[PDB]
Amino acid sequence: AAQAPRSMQWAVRNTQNASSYLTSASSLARAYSIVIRQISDLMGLIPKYNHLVYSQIPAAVKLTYQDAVNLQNYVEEKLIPTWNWMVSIMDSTEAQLRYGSALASAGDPGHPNHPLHAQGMMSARGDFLNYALSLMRSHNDEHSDVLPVLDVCSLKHVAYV
Amino acid sequence: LRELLSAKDARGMTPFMSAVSGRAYPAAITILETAQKIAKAEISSSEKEEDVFMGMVCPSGTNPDDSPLYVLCCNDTCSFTWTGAEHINQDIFECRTCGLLESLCCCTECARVCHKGHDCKLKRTSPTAYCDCWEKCKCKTLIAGQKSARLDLLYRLLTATNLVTLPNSRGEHLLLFLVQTVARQTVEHCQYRPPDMPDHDLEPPRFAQLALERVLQDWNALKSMIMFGSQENKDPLSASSRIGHLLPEEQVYLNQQSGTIRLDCFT
Ligand SMILES: [Zn+2]
Ligand SMILES: [Zn+2]
Ligand SMILES: [Zn+2]
């Protein structure tokens, strides 16, 4: 994982076998992508099929333009849920990134909290509370003068999708 | 009279603002009544009644740190008037402009008024200390004045003027200033005990609590505090307040959020 440039480093959990949930979440997304590619490939063959049956294989199913329509109708429907889930998360992420950049432009880099400038239990409870407070603020646009709390390294499964 | 009361001294202050700065609350009252009469006498002019009145009370271009309603609240006594030379746990400041370097110090009120405009910093030594300012300097917080007049003047200002809406020189709305004051006094005053050096053994001030209770009854004060950090109620200081010089895309993002750090810190 090659490391991000300074205009985006603030948005990464970084330093400026056991099981894990994220392993399994990621590998299922990896596996999902394969099937989507294969479906696309088969849809890719349809125009040439009246040649790529008989010139290639002893026997195969006859099919027609009307059937291609209905297949395509069916395929689109089955993707809508995952599409909505992808889109909504991506928009939310891009918004948080662009806002953090605009604030980095308008703010003062002399301040120790500027994105370009920047204990156990209590620091951890600090991290968690900063996160919960940033979450509650963000819902109503009550977040005008501090960086949104975010990490992108969890989002590997939306990257695959 | 209008000219004499709108004329500014060598520090920018009208006679009214001077009466407040000097704790001459009955004189401030006398002038403030008179200033209302004067503004109400010149209603025949092409100016609005208010412009004249604001000119005499708190003139345009006044540094916010000198706005009278704020100054009246800052006018408390030095802790030494009630602690004497006893050591109590309180906040303390060094003042380098005055040679009050890190072994020495003054209490919060001296730092706010006796050392206004100096290099002063919040000190890191133990809080169990009295305040050296009455001994090392010409300390202006030793005199209480007339308490009943101080309170009467506050009531009048709150109904006479829109000054409640201004933030101070650190972006603190007046209410956020008062409530921090009460919270601080609550700890300091619980250490008080009944019994060439200045008059000690006085009773501690309850003005901040009385002032907080009265201000909280004013709709304008309350609305002005709760709407703080809205796009209309633009915080002048430390708060992304200059934006027009950035390219338009970053403005359309950065206008959309709104602030609550101070409203949350108050609540
Ligand atoms: Zn003092
Ligand atoms: Zn003093
Ligand atoms: Zn000083």
UniProtKB/Swiss-Prot annotation, chain B:
- Sites where the protein binds Zn(2+) 3: C110, C114, C133, C139
In which tissues has expression of this protein been reported?
Widely expressed. Most abundant in testis and expressed at high levels in brain, pituitary and kidney.
Tell where it localizes.
Nucleus; Cytoplasm
Zinc finger (UBR-type) positions are 76-144
Which residues carry the post-translational modification Phosphoserine, per the record?
S126, S238, S258
Phosphothreonine occurs at which residues? T14, T34
Query: Which positions does UniProt annotate for Zn(2+) 2 binding?
Result: C95, C98, H115, H118
Which residues hold Zn(2+) 1?
C78, C107, C110, C131
Q: What role does it play?
A: E3 ubiquitin-protein ligase involved in different protein quality control pathways in the cytoplasm and nucleus. Mainly acts as a ubiquitin chain elongator that extends pre-ubiquitinated substrates. Component of the N-end rule pathway: ubiquitinates proteins bearing specific N-terminal residues that are destabilizing according to the N-end rule, leading to their degradation. Recognizes type-1 N-degrons, containing positively charged amino acids (Arg, Lys and His).
- What does UniProt say about this protein's domains? The UBR-type zinc finger forms a pocket that mediates recognition of type 1 N-degrons.
| Family stated for the protein in its record | Belongs to the UBR5 family.
User: Oligomeric state and partners?
Assistant: Homotetramer; composed of a dimer of dimers. Associates with CDK9 and TFIIS/TCEA1 and forms a transcription regulatory complex made of CDK9, RNAP II, UBR5 and TFIIS/TCEA1 that can stimulate target gene transcription (e.g. gamma fibrinogen/FGG) by recruiting their promoters. Associates with the E3 ligase complex containing DYRK2, EDD/UBR5, DDB1 and DCAF1 proteins (EDVP complex). Binds TOPBP1. Interacts with PIH1D1. Interacts with CIB1.
This chain belongs to the protein called: E3 ubiquitin-protein ligase UBR5
Source species, please?
Answer: Homo sapiens
**Portion of the full-length sequence here:** 1102 to 1384 of 2799
